[PDB]
User: Fold this.
Amino acid sequence: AVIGNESITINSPSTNVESDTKVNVTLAYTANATRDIVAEFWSSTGWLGQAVKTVSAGNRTETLTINLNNAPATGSGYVVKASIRPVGTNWTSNIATDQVNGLNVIP
Assistant:
């Protein structure tokens, strides 16, 4: 019932992020088992937050809400990273990844 590779794609945000304590990341993926999908939000100076969702096998688009302590300062240099990996594992088991650099946070 399984053929081909698992995958993950960041569909949004592509360019801009609204300033808020919640950052939504829309991910499309191919999971050939139950898997974890992870979205992270980084500034130019390092990791700010991430969200994880355990997803059932299939081909789908889902949106994860990343919770931050404070709204990020306006400017560029922000990064969204995504990965799909076996449930409960850390980054060393990543099956596929995506990333978007050069994001701007708007006032």
